[PDB]
Tab-separated table of C-alpha atoms and ligand atoms in Angstrom:
chain	number	residue	atom	x	y	z
A	1	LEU	CA	-0.904	0.064	0.223
A	2	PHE	CA	2.981	2.473	0.723
A	3	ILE	CA	4.693	1.862	-2.241
A	4	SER	CA	2.007	2.098	-4.544
A	5	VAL	CA	-0.085	5.787	-2.608
A	6	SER	CA	3.580	6.984	-2.602
A	7	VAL	CA	3.953	5.836	-7.127
A	8	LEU	CA	0.401	7.428	-7.070
A	9	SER	CA	1.633	11.079	-5.126
A	10	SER	CA	5.159	10.512	-7.657
A	11	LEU	CA	2.480	11.054	-10.963
A	12	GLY	CA	1.105	13.740	-9.190
A	13	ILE	CA	4.350	16.046	-8.366
A	14	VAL	CA	5.432	15.120	-11.578
A	15	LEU	CA	1.581	15.894	-13.943
A	16	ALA	CA	1.826	18.912	-11.244
A	17	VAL	CA	5.138	20.321	-12.159
A	18	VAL	CA	4.721	20.115	-15.889
A	19	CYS	CA	0.948	21.169	-16.058
A	20	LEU	CA	2.178	24.620	-13.550
A	21	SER	CA	5.459	25.145	-16.259
A	22	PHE	CA	2.900	24.732	-19.267
A	23	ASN	CA	0.687	27.635	-17.236
A	24	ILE	CA	3.735	29.879	-16.303
A	25	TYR	CA	5.069	29.592	-20.136
A	26	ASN	CA	2.238	31.613	-21.316
A	27	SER	CA	1.927	33.715	-18.176
A	28	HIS	CA	1.197	36.737	-20.382
A	29	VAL	CA	1.240	36.139	-24.122
A	30	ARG	CA	-2.530	34.893	-24.678
A	31	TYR	CA	-6.150	35.706	-22.382
A	32	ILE	CA	-4.304	33.335	-19.643
A	33	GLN	CA	-3.194	36.360	-18.566
A	34	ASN	CA	-7.026	37.089	-17.520
A	35	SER	CA	-7.219	34.368	-14.651
A	36	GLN	CA	-4.342	35.386	-12.548
A	37	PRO	CA	-2.208	32.385	-13.714
A	38	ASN	CA	-0.347	33.583	-9.775
A	39	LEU	CA	-3.866	31.903	-8.071
A	40	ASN	CA	-3.468	29.447	-10.061
A	41	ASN	CA	0.548	28.296	-9.418
A	42	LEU	CA	0.129	28.839	-5.767
A	43	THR	CA	-2.707	26.610	-5.902
A	44	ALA	CA	-0.581	24.160	-7.912
A	45	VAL	CA	2.318	24.159	-6.297
A	46	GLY	CA	-0.142	23.898	-2.857
A	47	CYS	CA	-1.127	20.536	-4.302
A	48	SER	CA	2.034	19.238	-5.092
A	49	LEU	CA	3.212	19.755	-1.706
A	50	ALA	CA	0.134	18.318	-0.445
A	51	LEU	CA	1.198	15.464	-2.742
A	52	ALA	CA	4.383	15.317	-0.935
A	53	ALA	CA	3.999	15.166	2.205
A	54	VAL	CA	2.744	12.009	1.566
A	55	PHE	CA	5.784	10.132	2.200
A	56	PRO	CA	5.808	11.583	5.693
A	57	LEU	CA	2.866	9.836	6.798
A	58	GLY	CA	4.179	5.873	5.478
A	59	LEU	CA	7.126	6.352	7.384
A	60	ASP	CA	6.987	4.187	10.172
A	61	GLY	CA	9.831	2.512	12.785
A	62	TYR	CA	10.010	0.005	9.499
A	63	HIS	CA	12.024	2.311	7.856
A	64	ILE	CA	12.932	5.496	10.283
A	65	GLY	CA	13.777	4.593	13.997
A	66	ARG	CA	13.715	6.412	17.292
A	67	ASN	CA	16.054	9.527	16.770
A	68	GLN	CA	15.011	10.368	13.119
A	69	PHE	CA	10.777	9.890	14.254
A	70	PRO	CA	10.456	14.035	15.802
A	71	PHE	CA	11.630	14.761	11.889
A	72	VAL	CA	9.113	13.162	10.445
A	73	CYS	CA	6.240	14.008	13.303
A	74	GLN	CA	7.119	17.774	11.271
A	75	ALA	CA	7.522	16.860	8.236
A	76	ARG	CA	4.140	15.645	7.982
A	77	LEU	CA	3.072	18.586	9.731
A	78	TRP	CA	4.582	21.048	7.857
A	79	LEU	CA	4.231	20.008	4.351
A	80	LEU	CA	0.437	18.963	5.265
A	81	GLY	CA	-0.685	21.958	6.808
A	82	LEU	CA	0.805	24.577	4.461
A	83	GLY	CA	0.372	22.932	1.221
A	84	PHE	CA	-3.094	23.100	2.225
A	85	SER	CA	-2.989	26.058	2.950
A	86	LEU	CA	-1.160	26.829	-0.026
A	87	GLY	CA	-3.083	25.644	-2.690
A	88	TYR	CA	-7.131	26.344	-0.692
A	89	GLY	CA	-6.581	29.234	-0.028
A	90	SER	CA	-5.592	30.579	-3.084
A	91	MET	CA	-8.931	29.116	-4.525
A	92	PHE	CA	-10.817	30.393	-1.205
A	93	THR	CA	-9.512	33.649	-2.598
A	94	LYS	CA	-9.936	33.920	-6.362
A	95	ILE	CA	-13.870	33.279	-4.951
A	96	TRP	CA	-13.893	35.894	-2.276
A	97	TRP	CA	-12.646	38.901	-4.700
A	98	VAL	CA	-15.241	37.463	-7.395
A	99	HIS	CA	-18.275	37.440	-4.181
A	100	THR	CA	-17.167	41.165	-3.246
A	101	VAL	CA	-17.030	42.449	-6.506
A	102	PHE	CA	-20.244	41.643	-7.378
A	103	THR	CA	-22.120	42.506	-4.857
A	104	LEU	CA	-10.484	43.929	-8.092
A	105	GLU	CA	-6.713	45.522	-8.456
A	106	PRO	CA	-4.032	42.283	-8.369
A	107	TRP	CA	-2.444	42.830	-5.098
A	108	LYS	CA	-5.323	42.387	-2.753
A	109	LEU	CA	-5.331	39.050	-3.648
A	110	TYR	CA	-2.028	39.000	-3.010
A	111	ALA	CA	-2.411	40.799	0.033
A	112	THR	CA	-5.331	38.243	1.172
A	113	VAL	CA	-3.805	35.115	0.299
A	114	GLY	CA	-0.423	35.813	1.544
A	115	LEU	CA	-2.696	36.648	5.118
A	116	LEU	CA	-4.619	32.928	4.716
A	117	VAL	CA	-1.353	31.579	4.975
A	118	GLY	CA	0.159	33.354	7.469
A	119	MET	CA	-2.262	32.901	9.387
A	120	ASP	CA	-2.276	28.946	9.151
A	121	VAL	CA	1.729	28.922	9.981
A	122	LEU	CA	1.729	31.184	13.125
A	123	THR	CA	-1.703	29.295	14.699
A	124	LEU	CA	0.591	25.909	13.522
A	125	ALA	CA	4.063	27.220	15.218
A	126	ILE	CA	2.453	28.812	17.658
A	127	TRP	CA	1.129	25.159	18.562
A	128	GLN	CA	4.087	23.368	18.172
A	129	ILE	CA	5.931	25.707	20.085
A	130	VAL	CA	3.826	25.226	23.435
A	131	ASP	CA	2.758	21.238	23.228
A	132	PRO	CA	5.641	19.749	20.551
A	133	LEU	CA	5.412	16.926	18.567
A	134	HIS	CA	6.653	13.378	20.246
A	135	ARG	CA	6.704	10.018	20.326
A	136	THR	CA	4.207	7.486	21.611
A	137	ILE	CA	4.289	4.299	21.021
A	138	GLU	CA	0.080	2.943	21.941
A	139	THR	CA	-0.222	-0.881	22.541
A	140	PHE	CA	-2.852	-3.972	22.753
A	141	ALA	CA	-3.480	-7.395	24.180
A	142	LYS	CA	-1.458	-10.176	24.804
A	143	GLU	CA	-1.757	-12.445	21.676
A	144	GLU	CA	-0.041	-16.200	21.383
A	145	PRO	CA	0.750	-16.655	17.399
A	146	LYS	CA	1.264	-20.911	17.926
A	147	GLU	CA	3.926	-21.507	15.547
A	148	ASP	CA	5.105	-23.746	17.707
A	149	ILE	CA	8.041	-20.877	19.160
A	150	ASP	CA	6.149	-20.821	23.010
A	151	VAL	CA	6.159	-17.252	22.380
A	152	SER	CA	3.627	-14.676	23.245
A	153	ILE	CA	3.102	-11.268	21.513
A	154	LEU	CA	2.573	-7.802	23.104
A	155	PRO	CA	1.563	-5.810	20.063
A	156	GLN	CA	2.174	-2.218	19.908
A	157	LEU	CA	1.504	0.920	17.971
A	158	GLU	CA	3.286	3.832	17.686
A	159	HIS	CA	1.849	7.549	16.555
A	160	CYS	CA	2.985	10.811	16.495
A	161	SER	CA	0.944	12.819	18.526
A	162	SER	CA	1.947	16.209	21.165
A	163	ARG	CA	0.862	15.698	24.725
A	164	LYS	CA	-2.351	17.014	24.546
A	165	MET	CA	-3.737	15.941	20.944
A	166	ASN	CA	-7.768	16.219	19.689
A	167	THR	CA	-8.482	19.585	21.453
A	168	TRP	CA	-5.054	22.168	19.553
A	169	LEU	CA	-6.178	18.848	16.364
A	170	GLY	CA	-10.021	19.631	17.007
A	171	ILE	CA	-9.499	23.707	17.339
A	172	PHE	CA	-7.646	23.059	13.523
A	173	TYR	CA	-10.461	21.395	12.485
A	174	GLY	CA	-13.098	23.233	13.434
A	175	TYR	CA	-12.096	26.204	12.095
A	176	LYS	CA	-10.158	24.919	8.636
A	177	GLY	CA	-13.677	22.597	8.625
A	178	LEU	CA	-15.689	26.721	9.367
A	179	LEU	CA	-13.687	28.216	6.344
A	180	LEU	CA	-14.347	24.983	3.874
A	181	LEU	CA	-18.046	25.408	3.857
A	182	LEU	CA	-17.631	29.756	3.447
A	183	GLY	CA	-15.331	28.915	1.126
A	184	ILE	CA	-18.415	26.778	-0.730
A	185	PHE	CA	-21.741	29.101	0.274
A	186	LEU	CA	-19.666	31.921	-1.977
A	187	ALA	CA	-18.505	29.217	-4.722
A	188	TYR	CA	-22.732	28.903	-4.524
A	189	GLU	CA	-23.338	32.301	-4.386
A	190	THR	CA	-20.834	33.722	-7.660
A	191	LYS	CA	-21.693	30.957	-10.130
A	192	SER	CA	-23.972	32.950	-12.360
A	193	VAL	CA	-21.120	35.743	-11.773
A	194	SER	CA	-19.331	35.595	-15.092
A	195	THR	CA	-16.984	39.002	-14.740
A	196	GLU	CA	-14.160	39.910	-17.725
A	197	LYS	CA	-10.982	39.887	-14.897
A	198	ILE	CA	-11.875	36.508	-13.611
A	199	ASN	CA	-12.340	34.081	-15.951
A	200	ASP	CA	-12.896	30.387	-14.771
A	201	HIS	CA	-14.109	31.509	-11.137
A	202	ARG	CA	-16.556	28.005	-12.083
A	203	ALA	CA	-13.439	26.028	-11.800
A	204	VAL	CA	-12.330	26.740	-8.628
A	205	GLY	CA	-16.323	26.752	-7.338
A	206	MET	CA	-16.215	22.820	-8.287
A	207	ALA	CA	-12.560	22.114	-6.999
A	208	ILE	CA	-13.559	23.496	-3.612
A	209	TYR	CA	-16.654	22.285	-3.508
A	210	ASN	CA	-13.809	18.369	-4.241
A	211	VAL	CA	-12.321	18.920	-1.669
A	212	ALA	CA	-14.019	20.947	0.853
A	213	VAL	CA	-16.937	17.498	0.818
A	214	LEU	CA	-13.288	14.809	0.906
A	215	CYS	CA	-12.376	16.768	3.305
A	216	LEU	CA	-14.693	17.060	5.714
A	217	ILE	CA	-15.309	13.451	4.744
A	218	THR	CA	-11.806	11.818	6.097
A	219	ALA	CA	-11.703	14.616	8.530
A	220	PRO	CA	-12.771	12.691	11.682
A	221	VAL	CA	-12.596	9.766	9.218
A	222	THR	CA	-8.952	9.311	9.986
A	223	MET	CA	-9.555	10.270	13.561
A	224	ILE	CA	-12.398	7.579	14.858
A	225	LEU	CA	-9.937	5.057	12.850
A	226	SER	CA	-6.403	5.849	14.566
A	227	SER	CA	-5.571	2.502	16.403
A	228	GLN	CA	-5.335	1.589	13.047
A	229	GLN	CA	-2.091	1.805	10.874
A	230	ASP	CA	-3.685	0.820	7.096
A	231	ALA	CA	-7.064	2.501	7.445
A	232	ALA	CA	-5.855	5.644	8.581
A	233	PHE	CA	-2.850	5.804	6.078
A	234	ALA	CA	-5.162	5.023	3.347
A	235	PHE	CA	-8.101	7.061	3.748
A	236	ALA	CA	-5.658	9.836	4.346
A	237	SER	CA	-3.245	9.598	1.412
A	238	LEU	CA	-6.010	9.510	-0.921
A	239	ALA	CA	-7.794	12.506	0.001
A	240	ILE	CA	-5.080	13.778	-1.261
A	241	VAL	CA	-3.792	12.381	-3.598
A	242	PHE	CA	-7.695	12.095	-5.107
A	243	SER	CA	-7.719	15.664	-4.450
A	244	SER	CA	-5.076	16.530	-5.411
A	245	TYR	CA	-5.611	14.657	-8.958
A	246	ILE	CA	-9.167	16.793	-9.715
A	247	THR	CA	-8.266	20.250	-8.313
A	248	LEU	CA	-5.353	20.037	-10.478
A	249	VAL	CA	-7.170	18.884	-14.017
A	250	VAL	CA	-10.067	20.756	-13.312
A	251	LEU	CA	-8.283	23.711	-12.656
A	252	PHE	CA	-5.667	23.457	-15.228
A	253	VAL	CA	-6.842	20.324	-18.525
A	254	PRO	CA	-9.687	23.077	-19.701
A	255	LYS	CA	-7.453	26.838	-20.260
A	256	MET	CA	-5.131	22.920	-22.726
A	257	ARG	CA	-7.937	22.434	-24.050
A	258	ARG	CA	-9.083	25.184	-24.823
A	259	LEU	CA	-5.550	27.349	-26.205
A	260	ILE	CA	-4.577	24.372	-27.855
A	261	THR	CA	-7.150	24.498	-31.194
B	1	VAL	CA	-26.869	-19.485	-1.478
B	2	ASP	CA	-25.808	-18.413	1.164
B	3	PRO	CA	-29.870	-16.948	3.282
B	4	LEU	CA	-26.699	-14.423	6.413
B	5	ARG	CA	-27.558	-15.999	9.210
B	6	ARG	CA	-27.035	-14.128	12.514
B	7	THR	CA	-23.889	-15.366	13.927
B	8	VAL	CA	-22.191	-13.688	17.689
B	9	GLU	CA	-19.494	-13.394	19.038
B	10	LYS	CA	-17.105	-12.892	22.302
B	11	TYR	CA	-14.551	-10.876	23.760
B	12	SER	CA	-12.628	-9.290	26.158
B	13	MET	CA	-14.580	-11.409	29.386
B	14	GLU	CA	-11.846	-9.160	32.534
B	15	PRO	CA	-14.402	-5.030	32.309
B	16	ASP	CA	-15.721	-5.106	35.866
B	17	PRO	CA	-18.987	-3.051	36.676
B	18	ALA	CA	-18.882	-0.584	39.182
B	19	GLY	CA	-18.242	-2.584	42.062
B	20	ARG	CA	-21.252	-4.853	42.419
B	21	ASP	CA	-19.017	-7.881	41.504
B	22	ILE	CA	-19.616	-9.521	38.511
B	23	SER	CA	-17.035	-9.968	35.897
B	24	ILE	CA	-18.981	-8.876	32.738
B	25	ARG	CA	-17.855	-10.185	29.590
B	26	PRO	CA	-19.177	-8.396	26.406
B	27	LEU	CA	-21.624	-10.280	22.931
B	28	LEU	CA	-21.541	-8.278	19.655
B	29	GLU	CA	-24.927	-9.947	17.583
B	30	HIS	CA	-24.140	-10.262	14.018
B	31	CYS	CA	-25.254	-10.800	10.332
B	32	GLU	CA	-23.059	-12.515	8.182
B	33	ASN	CA	-22.413	-15.976	6.296
B	34	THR	CA	-18.767	-17.410	4.450
B	35	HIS	CA	-18.374	-15.183	1.192
B	36	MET	CA	-20.096	-11.599	2.398
B	37	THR	CA	-17.712	-9.145	-0.161
B	38	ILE	CA	-18.307	-11.426	-2.882
B	39	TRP	CA	-22.443	-10.655	-2.912
B	40	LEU	CA	-21.246	-6.895	-1.300
B	41	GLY	CA	-18.881	-6.985	-4.121
B	42	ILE	CA	-21.051	-7.959	-7.632
B	43	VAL	CA	-24.035	-5.760	-5.945
B	44	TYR	CA	-22.235	-3.037	-5.205
B	45	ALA	CA	-20.791	-4.657	-8.788
B	46	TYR	CA	-23.619	-4.189	-10.619
B	47	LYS	CA	-25.156	-1.001	-8.580
B	48	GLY	CA	-21.855	0.994	-10.203
B	49	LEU	CA	-22.571	-0.218	-13.769
B	50	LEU	CA	-25.969	1.614	-14.147
B	51	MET	CA	-24.530	4.671	-11.850
B	52	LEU	CA	-21.746	4.922	-14.950
B	53	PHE	CA	-24.303	5.229	-17.339
B	54	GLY	CA	-26.338	7.760	-15.971
B	55	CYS	CA	-23.945	9.418	-15.954
B	56	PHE	CA	-22.829	8.958	-18.867
B	57	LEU	CA	-25.893	10.033	-20.724
B	58	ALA	CA	-26.529	12.543	-18.848
B	59	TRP	CA	-23.060	14.335	-20.070
B	60	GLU	CA	-23.884	13.132	-23.618
B	61	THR	CA	-27.305	15.483	-22.865
B	62	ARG	CA	-25.259	18.385	-22.239
B	63	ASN	CA	-25.806	20.763	-24.134
B	64	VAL	CA	-29.698	20.707	-24.718
B	65	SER	CA	-29.785	23.989	-22.417
B	66	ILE	CA	-33.279	24.249	-22.260
B	67	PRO	CA	-35.011	26.143	-19.279
B	68	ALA	CA	-36.989	23.196	-18.150
B	69	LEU	CA	-36.017	19.835	-18.821
B	70	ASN	CA	-32.178	19.950	-18.677
B	71	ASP	CA	-30.675	18.758	-15.397
B	72	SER	CA	-28.160	18.014	-15.683
B	73	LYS	CA	-25.610	19.690	-14.119
B	74	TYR	CA	-28.306	17.647	-10.748
B	75	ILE	CA	-27.597	14.796	-12.371
B	76	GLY	CA	-24.787	14.642	-12.244
B	77	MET	CA	-24.282	16.435	-8.474
B	78	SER	CA	-26.348	13.853	-7.255
B	79	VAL	CA	-24.578	10.716	-8.174
B	80	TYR	CA	-21.260	11.935	-7.160
B	81	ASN	CA	-21.860	12.389	-4.117
B	82	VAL	CA	-24.158	9.078	-4.132
B	83	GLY	CA	-21.383	7.651	-5.022
B	84	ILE	CA	-18.300	9.361	-2.883
B	85	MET	CA	-21.225	8.945	0.067
B	86	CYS	CA	-21.622	5.837	-0.760
B	87	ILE	CA	-18.291	4.124	-0.482
B	88	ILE	CA	-17.261	5.589	2.373
B	89	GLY	CA	-19.919	4.251	4.203
B	90	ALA	CA	-19.503	0.703	3.279
B	91	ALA	CA	-15.456	0.989	3.082
B	92	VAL	CA	-16.114	1.923	7.395
B	93	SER	CA	-18.427	-0.080	8.253
B	94	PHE	CA	-16.690	-2.526	7.596
B	95	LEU	CA	-14.329	-1.134	9.222
B	96	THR	CA	-15.748	-0.277	12.912
B	97	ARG	CA	-17.737	-3.534	13.338
B	98	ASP	CA	-16.786	-3.776	17.220
B	99	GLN	CA	-18.262	-0.131	17.459
B	100	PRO	CA	-21.787	-1.069	17.034
B	101	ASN	CA	-22.894	3.407	18.256
B	102	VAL	CA	-20.315	4.739	15.806
B	103	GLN	CA	-21.442	2.410	12.776
B	104	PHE	CA	-24.531	2.735	13.363
B	105	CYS	CA	-24.109	6.488	13.197
B	106	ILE	CA	-21.644	6.908	9.959
B	107	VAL	CA	-24.508	4.183	8.073
B	108	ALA	CA	-27.748	6.674	9.092
B	109	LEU	CA	-25.598	10.016	9.241
B	110	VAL	CA	-24.387	7.889	5.140
B	111	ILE	CA	-27.820	7.290	3.869
B	112	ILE	CA	-30.000	10.762	5.623
B	113	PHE	CA	-27.588	13.117	3.430
B	114	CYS	CA	-27.491	11.040	0.214
B	115	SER	CA	-31.105	11.063	0.454
B	116	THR	CA	-32.176	13.933	1.215
B	117	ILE	CA	-30.087	15.645	-1.008
B	118	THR	CA	-30.678	13.803	-3.524
B	119	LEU	CA	-34.413	14.657	-3.087
B	120	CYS	CA	-33.641	18.077	-2.872
B	121	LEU	CA	-31.330	18.614	-6.122
B	122	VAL	CA	-34.774	16.959	-8.056
B	123	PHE	CA	-37.542	18.227	-6.134
B	124	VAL	CA	-36.216	22.653	-4.506
B	125	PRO	CA	-35.631	23.392	-7.867
B	126	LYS	CA	-38.895	23.609	-9.611
B	127	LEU	CA	-40.977	24.693	-7.092
B	128	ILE	CA	-38.492	27.791	-6.167
B	129	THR	CA	-39.536	28.623	-9.799
B	130	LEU	CA	-43.240	28.591	-8.367
B	131	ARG	CA	-43.099	31.033	-6.578
C	1	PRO	CA	-43.879	13.351	-12.981
C	2	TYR	CA	-44.621	9.813	-12.860
C	3	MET	CA	-41.450	9.345	-13.098
C	4	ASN	CA	-40.826	11.845	-10.109
C	5	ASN	CA	-43.169	9.557	-8.157
C	6	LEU	CA	-41.002	6.568	-8.272
C	7	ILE	CA	-37.729	8.243	-6.431
C	8	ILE	CA	-39.818	9.992	-4.069
C	9	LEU	CA	-41.277	6.509	-3.507
C	10	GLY	CA	-37.853	5.840	-3.786
C	11	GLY	CA	-36.619	7.616	-1.327
C	12	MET	CA	-38.535	7.183	0.885
C	13	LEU	CA	-38.037	3.236	1.327
C	14	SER	CA	-34.639	4.223	2.037
C	15	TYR	CA	-35.320	6.435	4.662
C	16	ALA	CA	-37.080	3.578	6.300
C	17	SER	CA	-34.325	0.876	6.423
C	18	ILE	CA	-32.593	3.605	9.190
C	19	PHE	CA	-34.924	1.941	12.353
C	20	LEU	CA	-33.709	-1.536	10.602
C	21	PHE	CA	-30.409	-1.305	11.923
C	22	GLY	CA	-30.964	0.407	15.042
C	23	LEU	CA	-32.697	-3.769	15.841
C	24	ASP	CA	-29.542	-5.292	18.381
C	25	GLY	CA	-31.311	-7.922	19.952
C	26	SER	CA	-32.451	-5.740	22.899
C	27	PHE	CA	-35.745	-4.258	21.657
C	28	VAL	CA	-35.448	-8.433	19.073
C	29	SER	CA	-36.028	-11.347	19.521
C	30	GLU	CA	-33.229	-13.656	18.164
C	31	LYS	CA	-35.686	-15.716	16.010
C	32	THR	CA	-37.456	-12.137	14.179
C	33	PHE	CA	-33.354	-10.607	14.087
C	34	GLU	CA	-32.456	-12.806	11.025
C	35	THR	CA	-35.700	-12.198	9.177
C	36	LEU	CA	-35.031	-8.176	9.876
C	37	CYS	CA	-31.190	-8.638	8.592
C	38	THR	CA	-32.731	-9.226	4.866
C	39	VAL	CA	-35.298	-7.434	5.166
C	40	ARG	CA	-33.559	-4.088	5.321
C	41	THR	CA	-31.070	-5.625	2.146
C	42	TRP	CA	-34.392	-5.504	0.120
C	43	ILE	CA	-36.002	-2.471	1.366
C	44	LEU	CA	-32.862	-0.263	1.008
C	45	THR	CA	-31.190	-1.046	-2.494
C	46	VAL	CA	-35.045	-1.825	-4.246
C	47	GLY	CA	-34.865	2.168	-3.021
C	48	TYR	CA	-32.441	2.490	-4.324
C	49	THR	CA	-32.121	0.961	-7.878
C	50	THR	CA	-36.190	2.899	-7.850
C	51	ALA	CA	-34.882	6.480	-7.494
D	1	LIG	C1	-20.178	23.193	-7.272
D	1	LIG	C2	-20.699	24.230	-6.631
D	1	LIG	C3	-20.357	25.652	-7.786
D	1	LIG	C4	-19.467	24.087	-5.587
D	1	LIG	C5	-21.594	24.048	-6.865
D	1	LIG	C6	-22.964	23.546	-5.592
D	1	LIG	C7	-24.254	23.206	-5.340
D	1	LIG	C8	-24.504	23.003	-4.504
D	1	LIG	C9	-26.277	23.899	-4.186
D	1	LIG	C10	-25.039	21.894	-3.787
D	1	LIG	C11	-24.022	24.029	-2.998
D	1	LIG	C12	-24.321	23.178	-6.836
D	1	LIG	C13	-23.744	23.385	-7.741
D	1	LIG	C14	-22.085	23.582	-8.293
D	1	LIG	C15	-24.995	23.348	-8.434
D	1	LIG	O1	-24.903	24.343	-10.275
D	1	LIG	C16	-25.250	21.635	-9.644
D	1	LIG	F1	-24.180	22.137	-11.021
D	1	LIG	F2	-24.471	20.872	-9.556
D	1	LIG	F3	-25.924	21.661	-10.915
D	1	LIG	C17	-25.699	23.308	-8.670
D	1	LIG	O2	-27.451	23.076	-8.350
D	1	LIG	O3	-26.186	23.011	-6.944
């Protein structure tokens, strides 16, 4: 499972980099300048980071070791959080400006996306400096393997966890969930606007709905299924992989299908 | 072939009450058979096949563009929500067998959400114009 | 409208399958349970396919 989803995430980051190179290869020489290419390529790099955050999720004591563990936990946290922020804040900025200018200048877009990313990074950093992540082991009930070797096995399972999780994690999940619901609401409200300065607000609306649905599904399931490593890992990995694949395609393949006549 | 009989499992004899001197052994009633996965898989295969043909034919009729019966957007959205939520529910219910409350809450919310969406997205767009 | 009545029939059938999950054995005998475990499958699948 680990190597299969890692191959999938690698192909995902390859496609994301190819697509960002394409979109910047036609930066302003065509109508692409209408649909803000900076927001789109910020979304692409956010999806690339979120897909790259799949490898630290699968690395445990089978590969790394005890002393190299707090680096894997930190890679998990920072890659996943910053990737989600950079890949959702751009779409939310696009849709929020499309909403509020119809109920403008391209520097307010960057100002507010920087504000969102800064807020996410500041809160994640303050959480990580207050109660840092560290290795913790949780044990199961004893069992008896009957290979006639006459020994009792005490199955253990280790996972990155702070001192008091399910509280800070709960706050992050709730804040991101309210942001995602606002994204869905604003995307639904402004599906009829036909602004010419911003070309693809309907595509970012569809991608926002998809990402929000998949994230709101896989956020509590991973907390419930925590004591099963394969279930939780497969759920998080497939959520990331599918959300990134679909947002990349629905956000970019119409551009390269219209440009190629 | 497989009448899907009733089976009961037991585990964890040692749990104790508030001090009433009993070894409360908890057991749980289930409904399995010999090969549950094969039958459930062929059922989901048939349902997904009809879902896929419906989505295909709904995409093929995308460009009719009459303000009265186009409605392919609603077909797409409803089948997307139903597919994803039923797949997640069928994956989660099997992984939480030893938790009856969580299993029941998951499957009940899945059914409620899918049915209410596939009903609203078909009936509320009509009754919003008739006002 | 007749197909719409069909889909509303399917939707209410699927709603009716919520009750047949919570029945565990503290409300039901040991013989009605084994028949509920197939009547709920019947109801759910026919409601979905009808709709
Ligand atoms: C993708 C997104 C823009 C967020 C969207 C969201 C909705 C919801 C009402 C379910 C919130 C929606 C549509 C699009 C549709 O246009 C349709 F395409 F599904 F039909 C619709 O009427 O419903």
